[PDB]
Amino acid sequence: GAVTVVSWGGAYTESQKLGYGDPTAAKLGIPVNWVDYTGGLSEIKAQKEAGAITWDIMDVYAKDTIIGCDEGIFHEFDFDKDFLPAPDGTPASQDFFTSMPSKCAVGNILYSWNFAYNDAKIGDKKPKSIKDFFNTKKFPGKRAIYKGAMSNLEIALVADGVKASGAQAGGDLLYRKMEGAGIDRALAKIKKLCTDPNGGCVFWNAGAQPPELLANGEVVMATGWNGRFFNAQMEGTPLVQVWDAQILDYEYFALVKDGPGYADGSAMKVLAEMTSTEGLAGSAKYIAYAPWRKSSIAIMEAGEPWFKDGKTNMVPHMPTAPSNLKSHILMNPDYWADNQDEINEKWEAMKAGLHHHHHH
Numbered sequence: 001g002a003v004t005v006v007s008w009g010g011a012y013t014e015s016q017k018l019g020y021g022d023p024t025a026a027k028l029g030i031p032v033n034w035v036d037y038t039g040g041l042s043e044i045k046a047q048k049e050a051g052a053i054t055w056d057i058m059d060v061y062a063k064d065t066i067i068g069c070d071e072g073i074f075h076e077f078d079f080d081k082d083f084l085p086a087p088d089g090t091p092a093s094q095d096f097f098t099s100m101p102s103k104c105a106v107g108n109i110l111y112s113w114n115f116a117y118n119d120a121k122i123g124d125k126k127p128k129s130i131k132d133f134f135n136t137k138k139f140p141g142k143r144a145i146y147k148g149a150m151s152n153l154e155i156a157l158v159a160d161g162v163k164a165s166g167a168q169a170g171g172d173l174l175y176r177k178m179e180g181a182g183i184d185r186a187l188a189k190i191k192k193l194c195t196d197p198n199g200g201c202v203f204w205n206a207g208a209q210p211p212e213l214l215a216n217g218e219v220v221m222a223t224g225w226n227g228r229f230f231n232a233q234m235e236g237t238p239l240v241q242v243w244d245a246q247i248l249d250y251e252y253f254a255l256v257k258d259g260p261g262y263a264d265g266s267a268m269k270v271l272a273e274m275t276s277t278e279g280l281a282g283s284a285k286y287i288a289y290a291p292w293r294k295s296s297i298a299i300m301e302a303g304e305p306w307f308k309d310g311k312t313n314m315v316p317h318m319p320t321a322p323s324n325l326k327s328h329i330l331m332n333p334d335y336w337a338d339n340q341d342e343i344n345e346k347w348e349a350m351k352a353g354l355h356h357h358h359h360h
C-alpha cells in the first residue's frame with residue numbers, strides 16, 4: 001500500500017523525491033506519493049475531525065511539530081528505536097546534530113529565510129543589508145513578504161536596529177525583545193513599508209512565489225527560502241541572495257496518527273528510510289539545504305562538488321556556511337507555537353487595515 005507524504009512543492013518537493021523519496025519507494029516496495037501544501041495544520045485537523053485521514057507523513061514547520069504533538073495529531077517517536085543509526089553505528093539521537101523540539105519531530109534539513117533581488121532589473125545600486133530591504137528611498141518599489149507574521153517580525157526588528165544573537169544556548173536573544181512593545185514596533189515597521197507609496201507589499205504563500213515575482217519584475221526585493229532562490233539561480237535566473245539577518249530554521253517530518261499506513265507500519269518504514277544518512281545527504285545534491293545528520297553533512301563535504309552536475313560545490317550555498325551566518329537569527333519555534341494566535345490577530349488586523357485605507 002502507498003504512503004502519502006505532504007510537502008511544500010516546487011524545488012523542495014523535487015529535492016525530496018529525487019534525493020530520498022523515489023529511492024525509498026524502490027528499496028522498500030512501498031510506493032511514496034507526494035501532495036503539495038503551504039504549511040500549518042488546518043488541513044490535517046479537518047481530515048482528523050472528519051475521520052477521513054489520507055495523509056501519512058507531513059513535512060512541517062518546527063512550530064507545528066510542537067503544536068501537532070500537543071494536539072495529538074502526530075506520533076510520539078522512540079527516537080533511537082524508530083530512526084536509523086549512522087553507518088558507523090552512532091545512534092540517531094547522537095547523529096542528528098541537536099535535540100528535537102518535540103517528541104513528534106524527526107529532522108530532515110535546515111533552511112534559511114533570507115531575501116533576494118534580480119541583478120538584471122534592480123539597477124546600478126545593489127541591496128546588501130536587511131535595512132536596504134526596508135529603504136524605499138534608496139530602493140523604491142514593491143516588496144514581497146511572507147503572508148504570516150512569523151519571520152517578518154524578526155527581520156523588521158533587526159532592520160530597526162534591535163540586536164539578534166544568532167544561535168546560542170537558550171535560543172536567539174531576539175525573542176526576549178519580542179514582547180508586546182517589540183511586537184508593536186515590528187508591526188508598525190511592516191505597516192510603514194506596505195503603506196509607503198514608494199514601497200508596497202505582495203504577500204507570498206508558496207515557496208515558489210518569491211523567485212517568480214523577482215524573475216518577472218513584479219517586486220524589487222522578495223523575502224523567501226534560500227533553496228528556492230538557489231534553484232532559480234541554477235536555472236539561469238540572475239537573482240542575488242542577501243544573507244544579512246537571514247533566519248536559520250530547522251525542518252522536520254512528523255508521522256500522522258491513524259493515516260492509511262499508520263497501523264500497518266508502512267509509513268514508519270518509509271519515514272525511517274527517508275531520514276537515513278544516505279537519504280538526507282542525497283537531497284542536498286538537488287537543493288541548498290543542509291542535512292540534519294552529522295554523518296550526512298560529512299558525506300556531502302567529502303563528496304564535493306556535491307551538486308547533481310558533479311561540478312558545483314554545495315557547501316558555500318548552505319544555510320550553515322560561516323559566510324552565510326555572519327548576522328543570522330536563529331528561529332525560535334516555541335515562541336511561535338506559544339504565541340502565534342495572539343500575534344496573528346494583530347497581524348491580520350494590520351493587513352486588513354492596509355486594504356481599508358487603500359484607495360483604488
Ligand SMILES: C[SH](C)CCC(=O)O
Nearest residue numbers: 008012111207225227
Ligand atoms: C519546507 S519550507 C518551510 C522551507 C524550504 C522550502 O520549501 O524551500
